[PDB]
Amino acid sequence: SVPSQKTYQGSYGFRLGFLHSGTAKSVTCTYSPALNKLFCQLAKTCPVQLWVDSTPPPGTRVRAMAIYKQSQHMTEVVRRCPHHERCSDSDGLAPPQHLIRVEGNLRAEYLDDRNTFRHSVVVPCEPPEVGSDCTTIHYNYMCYSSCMGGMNRRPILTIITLEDSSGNLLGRDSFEVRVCACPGRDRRTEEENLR
């Protein structure tokens, strides 16, 4: 089955935000609002902001999951390729098969769904650091979009869901991702292809 990707702010006015990182050749993570698409290098830090209009209950959590974007591929589980799942680049918490990791959060949990077999990573929802207006989660994507036997050039979406302590839906947002060697160049190209 295919998880919903419908944008849903819910009772708390949940939505994502992204930094404005530009498109220099040196950039390692950059987001295109026009394409709703994040471009990043392999295993590099990707800051994603969480914004709400009101404070959700303690015990609320934030889950990230990847799916294939194209209709003819959406039912296939997104996972790391046969090379990367065996490269022993473990952080001690993430299963080596999982494409999406959360960086630097000791309370991250990783799920292999027993019915759909899909992977996800979930962390507790927390208020912003003192002085800040939003909370930032740092994600890593652990295969290239081009990885043979893995994504194999197929575009993916990341779906971020806000959940209660039971796992019930409180909010949802999503963005496309391309993991590539030169995110700046690729963002510029795709934005021009759209123009």
143 annotated as belonging to a binding site for a ligand = yes
Q: Which is nearer to Zn ion, 100 or 162 (CB)?
A: 100
How many residues does this entry show for the chain? 195
Separation of alpha carbons 174 and 159, rounded Å: 4
The answer to whether 98 contacts Zn ion (rule: CB under 5 A) is no
Closest C-alpha to 47, from 22, 27, 18: 18
Q: Which of 125, 143, 147, 151 is the binder for ligand P96 (CB under 6 A)?
A: 125
Separation of alpha carbons 38 and 18, rounded Å: 9
Q: Tell the residue number behind the tokens 């019915």, with chain if given.
A: 115
Q: What phi and psi, each to the nearest 5 degrees, are found at residue 184? A: -60, -50
Separation of alpha carbons 153 and 147, rounded Å: 7
40 annotated as belonging to a binding site for a ligand = no
147 annotated as belonging to a binding site for a ligand = yes
The binder of 33, among Zn ion, ligand P96, none, by C-beta within 5 to 8 A per type, is none
Minimum gap (Å) between residue 59 Cβ and ligand P96: 7
The answer to whether 45 contacts ligand P96 (rule: CB under 6 A) is no
The answer to whether 134 contacts ligand P96 (rule: CB under 6 A) is yes
The answer to whether 56 contacts ligand P96 (rule: CB under 6 A) is yes
The answer to whether 40 contacts Zn ion (rule: CB under 5 A) is no
Separation of alpha carbons 108 and 126, rounded Å: 12
The answer to whether 82 contacts ligand P96 (rule: CB under 6 A) is no
**If DSSP states are collapsed to H, E and C, what string results for 38-103?**
EEECCCCCEEEEEECCCCCCCCCEEEEEEEECCCCCCCCCCCCCCCHHHCCCCCCCCCCCCCEEEC
Minimum gap (Å) between residue 61 Cβ and ligand P96: 9
* Per-residue mark of binding to Zn ion, 139-168 (x: CB under 5 A): ----x---x--x------------------
| Footprint (CB under 6 A) of ligand P96, residues 146-175 | none
The binder of 1, among ligand P96, Zn ion, none, by C-beta within 5 to 8 A per type, is none
Beta bridge partners of 102: 139
Q: Which of 16, 48, 50, 66 is the binder for ligand P96 (CB under 6 A)?
A: 50
Residues tagged in the binding site annotation: 81, 84, 143, 147
Binding-site ranges for Zn ion (CB under 5 A): 81, 84, 143, 147, 150
